[PDB]
Prior knowledge:
It is a single chain. By secondary structure, this protein is an alpha+beta fold. The chain folds into 4 domains: 1-69 and 125-189 and 363-383, ATPase, nucleotide binding domain (Nucleotidyltransferase, domain 5, 2-Layer Sandwich), CATH 3.30.420; 70-124, Defensin A-like (2-Layer Sandwich); 190-230 and 315-362, Nucleotidyltransferase, domain 5 (2-Layer Sandwich), CATH 3.30.420; 231-314, Actin, Chain A, domain 4 (Alpha-Beta Complex), CATH 3.90.640. It is 34% helix and 27% strand. It is built from 12 helices and 18 strands. It has helices at 55-58, 83-88, 118-137, 154-166, 177-184, 232-251, 259-275, 301-307, 309-313, 316-325, 346-355, 370-382; strands spanning 9-12, 17-24, 27-30, 40-41, 44-46, 51-53, 68-69, 95-99, 102-109, 112-116, 143-148, 170-176, 195-202, 207-215, 218-227, 281-290, 293-300, 335-339. The strands form 5 sheets. Strands 1, 2, 3, 4, 11 and 12 form a 6-stranded mixed sheet that branches. A 4-stranded mixed sheet has the order 15-14-13-18, sandwiched between helices. A 3-stranded antiparallel sheet has the order 6-5-7. It is globular. It binds 8-bromoadenosine and magnesium ion. 8-bromoadenosine binds at residues 16-17, 203-204, 232-233, 270, 273-274, 277, 341-342, 344-345, 368. Residues 4-382 are annotated as: Nucleotide-binding domain (NBD). This is Heat shock 70 kDa protein 1A. Its main location: cytoplasm.
Amino acid sequence: GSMAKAAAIGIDLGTTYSCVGVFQHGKVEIIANDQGNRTTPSYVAFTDTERLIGDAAKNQVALNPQNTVFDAKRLIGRKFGDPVVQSDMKHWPFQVINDGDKPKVQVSYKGETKAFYPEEISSMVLTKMKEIAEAYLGYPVTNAVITVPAYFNDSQRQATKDAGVIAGLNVLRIINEPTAAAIAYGLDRTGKGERNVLIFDLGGGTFDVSILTIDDGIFEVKATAGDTHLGGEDFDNRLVNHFVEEFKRKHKKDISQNKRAVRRLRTACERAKRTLSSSTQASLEIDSLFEGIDFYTSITRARFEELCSDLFRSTLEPVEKALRDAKLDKAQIHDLVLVGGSTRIPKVQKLLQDFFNGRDLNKSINPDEAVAYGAAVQAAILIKSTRAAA
Length: 390
Ligand SMILES: Nc1ncnc2c1nc(Br)n2[C@@H]1O[C@H](CO)[C@@H](O)[C@H]1O
Ligand SMILES: [Mg+2]
């Protein structure tokens, strides 16, 4: 008769991390990769012998910065001359070249100099997400929904589809990240009547606020706002500067010029930062940090909160701006949705909850997984081919 159909997948193709889910047995499974990670770094590294993707690429970045590519999403569908591209290039250790006013990343790979379009790098990340899904399902996957920021234009959306096609995926649809997060919570399944939904998306490097109106399952993007210079990495930076000062006071030594020491400090700071989302304090223990000096210290959640206080408060400016643009008052928002790992920060949650006069925040779906979750829900809907009964 008719052979069983393979499940379709939902992929959040993120700037820093990507996530893949599948809707089966009436529920979403967010699929861990073979290192046990439910999210995979959107990184690709090139050596004389290998092309590494995901954790393997991010884990060797320290010594291979010129040939480890990340942030390709910031280049996707953009012109080389775009001022965003020109500014971003100053922060990247890898080379970005101009090919007909289209950016390409240029690396050393398998004995040669090779340049790739951003969609080619993203296709490599998509190939890894497809393989992660296939390792769990135990069969080849063909169909996928891929998400993008609501602000992506036609060129950025087409270049994302192109990345999916290069990876051998059939792209069912390109859907907006805030829309996918709303779908994850079933906010399009509440029946008749308008619902105003605010998506609060705090990433590693950027912050996006979106206001959507949902009416009879139909989504309309009412307003987008944000801060391109606000993310998790800025909180890590504040902790780094704090501990550099602390080492200076305690040992009368400036570590800031030993790249390894600074990197080991940043790595420990990011983990201490995550611990502080669940505990009121966190220890920091680094052996032989600088000149054989062991750095054994601690930081309270209160001190971390004070260190990033202005940054956390600044998340409310794009919220107020988006509300003005949507011509809505805060009480008129029915649902608040958290997206991004940085939203696990209790102080960030409290500031936003206080702004919306004590309202509950939807955070029950892991915020770094909600976009893939919604994309997986939609992918299963899009492949249905029910024929009506008489
Ligand atoms: N529990 C957590 N508490 C605070 N921050 C977190 C957490 N989990 C994740 Br994931 N992050 C941060 O999210 C960003 C994703 O690119 C990075 O800055 C991560 O450090
Ligand atoms: Mg995201």
